[PDB]
Amino acid sequence: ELAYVRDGVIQFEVQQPMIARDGPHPVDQPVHNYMVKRIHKRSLSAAF
Amino acid sequence: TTQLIQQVSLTDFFRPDIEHAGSIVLILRHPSDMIGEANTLTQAGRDPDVLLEGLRNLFNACTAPWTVGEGGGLRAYVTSLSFIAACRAEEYTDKQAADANRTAIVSAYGCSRMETRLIRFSECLRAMVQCHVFPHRFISFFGSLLEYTIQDNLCNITAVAKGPQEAARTDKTSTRRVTANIPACVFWDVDKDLHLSADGLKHVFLVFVYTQRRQREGVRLHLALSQLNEQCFGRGIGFLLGRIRAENAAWGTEGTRALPLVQLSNDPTSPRCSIGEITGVNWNLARQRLYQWTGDFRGLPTQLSCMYAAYTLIGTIPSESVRYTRRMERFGGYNVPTIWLEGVVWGGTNTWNECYY
Amino acid sequence: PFEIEVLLPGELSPAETSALQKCEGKIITFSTLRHRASLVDIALSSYYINGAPPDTLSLLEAYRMRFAAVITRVIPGKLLAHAIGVGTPTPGLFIQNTSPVDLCNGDYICLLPPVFGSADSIRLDSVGLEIVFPLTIPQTLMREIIAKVVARAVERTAAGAQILPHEVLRGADVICYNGRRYELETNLQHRDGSDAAIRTLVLNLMFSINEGCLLLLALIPTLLVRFPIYETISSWISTSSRLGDTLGTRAILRVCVFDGPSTVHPGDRTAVIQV
Amino acid sequence: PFEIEVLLPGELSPAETSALQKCEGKIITFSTLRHRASLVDIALSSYYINGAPPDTLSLLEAYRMRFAAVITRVIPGKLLAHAIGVGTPTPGLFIQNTSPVDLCNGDYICLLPPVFGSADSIRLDSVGLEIVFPLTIPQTLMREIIAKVVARAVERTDVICYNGRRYELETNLQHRDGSDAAIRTLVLNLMFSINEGCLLLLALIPTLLVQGAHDGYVNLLIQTANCVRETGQLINIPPMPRIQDGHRRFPIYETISSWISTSSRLGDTLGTRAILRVCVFDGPSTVHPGDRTAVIQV
Amino acid sequence: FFKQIRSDDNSLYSAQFDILLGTYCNTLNFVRFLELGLSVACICTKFP
């Protein structure tokens, strides 16, 4: 049922670690990420 | 396999009651465009409002005369071929057939305000061809009538557009089939004048012969049926109409030394005018004489003042060795000679070819 | 029945989608006929030649050299169309009027590039392309329209060239059809398309007529009571034939209305038949 | 769909029937259209005008006069051909390229007699006749060839550059009765393309020559032209007359209108009209000589 | 919002949906100090 797909979509979710250091600078913060991706359509043909 | 066209209109030029099923019906453009074209295309010197005089009296002798100017969609759209055939019956060669059709269309119609209507239309066309407003761009073509419904002075008709003639079902007559019917006055086949074999496929055309003189103009309407080619019909018609062509070339316009360019360009030692002075600083003493030529051409026959015919393809007949039949039958309360065409496929775009030679 | 499917692009703004959906019965023009195509063939970008945007002469030539089709329906993710090409039996073909003049029954349809005013068209700034639509006009008016626009151009050129103008005139040019006048180009200012798209056209149309009605006189001096003389005739014949083939008139559609209003106005959609 | 069935003569040799079967997608002409016909009308003998093989200018007119047809699948006995001219639906039509030049998509096809080297044509020694086939070239080449042939005829009473290769024309004009018809039909249009409007166009010549400079475009328009280029520096063109009724008339309108119709009629009267358009589906963009393409009716 | 169609003007047989093709995430790992080879460079101890 692909002929009526009308732009399906997929998504991701990742998070990165952090290091504990102390000195003359601000502290860190755990950050999260979010992405998203679309689809692309193409066909094939042959004669007879 | 075929298509139909419907349209409602006033019944002062067309009567779907008396007209036989299968006759030709034409339509007209808005009359308001005639004056806008006449006042800009009228020949120099001629009066441009004689057409307006001839046109106003037409609707003055027609029902609902207070309905001209807005074009709301309730005007006399369509008309019949026999109507124009009777309006110009005094110009066809077949004297008796012309006048018979004329009296028939007079009697079968109201017969009270019909003769006046006809003469108004007559000089209406006469004034139409007076300022080069030729009535071959204002008269279109519809197919043969197929069905109609009328209640009073207003009718809804439907006709074929293109395709086989006997592929429809009129479904209220005796049979469900109809064939093309034409008055014998307009029919004019050219191959039997040109003396060639009449076998195979033949095309159908409508011609509009024009006569241009002083206070005497004429316009007929002929339905030609010939096997000649699409464009070769023009060369064929001129051979038969060679008289009117020459008459128009001399009576069409009723309202200087050469120059030897090639001679003085083939020989040197002529006054030259190099680009250095046309640059545009003193471009009068440079071109002081350079020649004189004293030349002007104002009054000369244009290709539009010598036109004498305008034709257009309508349909073909694939069946070889056509057998068109002519006979007299009752039309209302009178008998008229009609020609019956069978198996004619309509088609072709409405493009007019003008024979100005 | 032959149909074309134009692929709708992804990530299109909703205002643009609605503007596209609004243009239902409009004529697009395809270079090579194929079941699947892209928006680059429909956009103006495919029409311009020699880098520069197309001219009126170029557009007139492209309208002959290129095939036509009509948009049938718009889907939120797809776009369809039907050709007026080889033999396809398109059922229920309808067209939307784009010209300011009206249309009636039994009128034949022909195509033109926009000359009267600025062309109205859709333009996607996200993808960055515009889709111009050709003007649809009856047959009996196109010759007059072309003649009048070329005459206006040549009159402007003459008034500029002559040291003094011959202004004395009849007022303003008008085009009347079905008892409705148009009154084009009232003001003298606003030279929007005076020499923007008809420049080369008016140049060539002046040159050919000059050549013709000078060569006749040069050949026969009886009319008014080192030199090739033959390549000139050859070139004139060639140029005249090519210009006449360019400025042709070929009907493409016929307005056939059944059980509907006869006269139609700019903006209404009418069912037509393939000639 | 209309089809005309050509009856091949009997007793035909195998070599000749093979040579005919080779001819599959070519154009032929019929003087009169009918479902059943013979080989004599296709034969070149039917082109004879008085008693002899025709001339180039006579073929140029016979092509307009005659109906056209396209051959299709041939069987050993009969010969099948479909019609073109009369409006008739034909699905899947094709033509074989007979001209030395190449064709591409969206090209209008014309018809001209063989102007290049001796035309290839099937000859039947047993029957005693030959069948020449007309050539098919695009519109631009057609117009150029017609212009050059008319100029050569005028001179009597040729190289062409297309796709960077030079072709030579050898024209045949051993007849004379048909040569003056071209002159007559040229001069008629030349005379009818003149009216009261040319005066302004001729007076607009000095500003045209001026605009030629500092343009870079009009120069090419000027170089190919000779009449105006010579007259702008040789004639004075008296200034101007008045108009009879200038209060409601427009005199530069007819000179620009009538010329359009004149030019549209000239290209068809001097030579032949367009007959087809090439539009191949799922095929190559360009076609080489001898190959077949799918074309649509004009 | 109000509208009514004459008899039947399409615009109804236009099933066009959107599909989600699943999600993907990640789980980070944890590194311990003693598991590293650097622990043999010092002697660590806890002093509350």
XYZ file of N, CA and C in Angstrom, chain D residues 3-91:
267
model
N -8.426 2.426 -44.750
C -7.328 1.706 -45.371
C -7.624 1.504 -46.848
N -6.601 1.701 -47.672
C -6.682 1.455 -49.103
C -5.801 0.262 -49.433
N -6.372 -0.707 -50.140
C -5.712 -1.971 -50.445
C -5.230 -1.939 -51.888
N -3.915 -1.932 -52.073
C -3.318 -1.942 -53.401
C -3.122 -3.388 -53.831
N -3.651 -3.733 -55.001
C -3.563 -5.095 -55.513
C -2.263 -5.246 -56.292
N -1.343 -6.047 -55.766
C -0.090 -6.278 -56.464
C -0.336 -7.136 -57.702
N 0.316 -6.827 -58.820
C 0.177 -7.678 -60.003
C 0.723 -9.068 -59.730
N 0.156 -10.049 -60.423
C 0.602 -11.414 -60.278
C 1.974 -11.623 -60.894
N 2.322 -12.902 -61.038
C 3.528 -13.365 -61.725
C 4.790 -12.622 -61.287
N 4.761 -12.017 -60.104
C 5.880 -11.201 -59.666
C 7.053 -12.078 -59.244
N 8.254 -11.616 -59.557
C 9.442 -12.391 -59.253
C 9.764 -12.333 -57.760
N 10.498 -13.328 -57.248
C 10.884 -13.283 -55.830
C 11.758 -12.094 -55.491
N 12.691 -11.731 -56.374
C 13.526 -10.563 -56.121
C 12.675 -9.314 -55.967
N 11.697 -9.132 -56.855
C 10.866 -7.937 -56.796
C 9.961 -7.945 -55.573
N 9.398 -9.100 -55.206
C 8.540 -9.101 -54.024
C 9.359 -8.854 -52.758
N 10.603 -9.348 -52.707
C 11.463 -9.035 -51.571
C 11.803 -7.549 -51.530
N 12.135 -6.966 -52.684
C 12.420 -5.537 -52.734
C 11.217 -4.715 -52.295
N 10.012 -5.157 -52.644
C 8.813 -4.433 -52.233
C 8.573 -4.575 -50.735
N 8.721 -5.792 -50.201
C 8.576 -5.995 -48.762
C 9.563 -5.141 -47.983
N 10.744 -4.894 -48.553
C 11.662 -3.945 -47.919
C 10.988 -2.599 -47.683
N 10.192 -2.134 -48.642
C 9.435 -0.889 -48.514
C 8.235 -1.142 -47.610
N 8.327 -0.662 -46.367
C 7.322 -0.956 -45.354
C 6.607 0.285 -44.836
N 7.312 1.401 -44.684
C 6.723 2.554 -44.033
C 6.816 3.843 -44.818
N 6.672 3.762 -46.136
C 6.881 4.914 -46.995
C 5.564 5.528 -47.459
N 5.680 6.743 -47.970
C 4.543 7.551 -48.390
C 4.322 7.374 -49.883
N 3.056 7.256 -50.272
C 2.647 7.167 -51.665
C 1.502 8.146 -51.895
N 1.190 8.373 -53.167
C 0.168 9.333 -53.555
C -0.883 8.666 -54.429
N -2.127 9.090 -54.234
C -3.269 8.619 -55.004
C -3.976 9.818 -55.614
N -4.208 9.769 -56.925
C -4.951 10.844 -57.575
C -6.396 10.877 -57.090
N -7.023 9.710 -56.984
C -8.389 9.579 -56.505
C -8.448 8.479 -55.455
N -9.101 8.769 -54.334
C -9.132 7.860 -53.199
C -10.258 6.846 -53.360
N -9.947 5.582 -53.083
C -10.913 4.498 -53.180
C -10.328 3.276 -52.491
N -11.215 2.394 -52.026
C -10.767 1.235 -51.261
C -9.919 0.292 -52.107
N -10.278 0.112 -53.374
C -9.555 -0.774 -54.276
C -8.924 0.049 -55.386
N -7.636 -0.179 -55.636
C -6.920 0.547 -56.671
C -5.893 -0.381 -57.307
N -5.202 0.136 -58.318
C -4.205 -0.611 -59.068
C -2.823 -0.017 -58.837
N -1.827 -0.632 -59.471
C -0.449 -0.179 -59.355
C -0.112 0.955 -60.311
N -0.947 1.196 -61.322
C -0.610 2.192 -62.332
C -0.618 3.596 -61.742
N -1.545 3.883 -60.830
C -1.595 5.218 -60.246
C -0.401 5.472 -59.335
N 0.079 4.436 -58.645
C 1.293 4.583 -57.850
C 2.506 4.741 -58.752
N 2.513 4.066 -59.900
C 3.646 4.148 -60.808
C 3.934 5.593 -61.210
N 5.196 5.840 -61.573
C 5.593 7.175 -62.004
C 4.900 7.575 -63.297
N 4.487 6.595 -64.103
C 3.800 6.892 -65.353
C 2.548 7.728 -65.138
N 1.905 7.605 -63.976
C 0.718 8.400 -63.696
C 1.048 9.864 -63.435
N 2.323 10.194 -63.227
C 2.706 11.587 -63.030
C 2.916 12.322 -64.345
N 2.887 11.610 -65.471
C 3.128 12.224 -66.771
C 2.141 13.354 -67.017
N 2.640 14.465 -67.557
C 1.791 15.635 -67.742
C 1.256 15.679 -69.172
N 2.140 15.753 -70.167
C 1.676 15.710 -71.547
C 1.912 14.338 -72.163
N 3.173 13.934 -72.268
C 3.515 12.594 -72.701
C 4.802 12.095 -72.085
N 5.355 12.858 -71.148
C 6.717 12.615 -70.695
C 6.793 12.559 -69.174
N 7.874 12.019 -68.612
C 8.087 12.114 -67.168
C 8.017 13.554 -66.705
N 7.570 13.792 -65.481
C 7.276 15.154 -65.035
C 8.550 15.908 -64.673
N 8.373 17.194 -64.397
C 9.429 18.075 -63.933
C 9.321 18.250 -62.426
N 10.341 18.890 -61.853
C 10.337 19.173 -60.422
C 9.165 20.070 -60.040
N 8.957 21.150 -60.789
C 7.860 22.055 -60.477
C 6.499 21.414 -60.708
N 6.404 20.453 -61.628
C 5.133 19.771 -61.838
C 4.859 18.769 -60.724
N 5.903 18.109 -60.225
C 5.735 17.251 -59.059
C 5.359 18.062 -57.825
N 5.934 19.262 -57.684
C 5.579 20.132 -56.561
C 4.084 20.425 -56.514
N 3.417 20.438 -57.663
C 1.979 20.672 -57.714
C 1.170 19.387 -57.669
N 1.683 18.316 -58.271
C 1.016 17.025 -58.175
C 0.928 16.566 -56.728
N 1.925 16.916 -55.914
C 1.894 16.516 -54.512
C 0.765 17.209 -53.761
N 0.525 18.490 -54.047
C -0.618 19.166 -53.441
C -1.928 18.603 -53.968
N -1.974 18.280 -55.259
C -3.229 17.826 -55.852
C -3.629 16.438 -55.361
N -2.668 15.544 -55.157
C -2.978 14.157 -54.849
C -3.161 13.936 -53.353
N -3.974 12.935 -53.018
C -4.097 12.467 -51.645
C -2.873 11.645 -51.265
N -2.534 11.665 -49.982
C -1.372 10.949 -49.483
C -1.788 9.678 -48.748
N -0.852 8.732 -48.664
C -1.096 7.506 -47.920
C 0.234 6.935 -47.457
N 0.164 6.111 -46.418
C 1.336 5.505 -45.792
C 1.198 3.993 -45.846
N 2.250 3.306 -46.308
C 2.198 1.850 -46.409
C 2.338 1.220 -45.026
N 1.835 -0.003 -44.900
C 1.911 -0.767 -43.660
C 2.247 -2.204 -44.045
N 2.027 -3.138 -43.119
C 2.338 -4.550 -43.321
C 1.892 -5.039 -44.690
N 2.853 -5.497 -45.489
C 2.598 -5.989 -46.837
C 2.559 -7.509 -46.790
N 1.629 -8.095 -47.534
C 1.529 -9.546 -47.639
C 1.959 -9.921 -49.050
N 2.295 -11.188 -49.326
C 2.773 -11.534 -50.677
C 1.800 -11.176 -51.787
N 0.500 -11.214 -51.516
C -0.479 -10.918 -52.540
C -0.871 -9.456 -52.633
N -1.265 -8.863 -51.511
C -1.830 -7.522 -51.493
C -0.842 -6.526 -50.897
N -1.230 -5.253 -50.937
C -0.411 -4.151 -50.435
C -1.309 -3.225 -49.624
N -0.990 -3.052 -48.344
C -1.861 -2.335 -47.424
C -1.361 -0.919 -47.169
N -2.276 0.043 -47.245
C -1.921 1.435 -47.028
C -3.059 2.154 -46.320
N -2.699 3.009 -45.372
C -3.651 3.838 -44.652
C -3.596 5.271 -45.165
N -4.672 6.011 -44.923
C -4.799 7.373 -45.419
C -4.369 8.384 -44.361
N -4.082 9.603 -44.816
C -3.600 10.657 -43.929
C -4.496 11.883 -44.011
N -4.668 12.413 -45.221
C -5.317 13.694 -45.435
C -6.674 13.856 -44.784
N -7.644 13.041 -45.198
C -8.974 13.111 -44.616
C -8.911 12.723 -43.141
N -9.666 13.445 -42.316
C -9.680 13.193 -40.889
C -10.089 11.778 -40.542
N -9.131 10.974 -40.089
C -9.377 9.570 -39.787
C -8.455 9.111 -38.663
N -8.981 8.437 -37.643
C -8.122 7.986 -36.539
C -7.270 6.797 -36.958
N -5.959 6.923 -36.757
C -5.013 5.850 -37.044
C -4.148 5.639 -35.810
N -4.280 4.516 -35.111
C -3.420 4.271 -33.950
C -2.102 3.619 -34.335
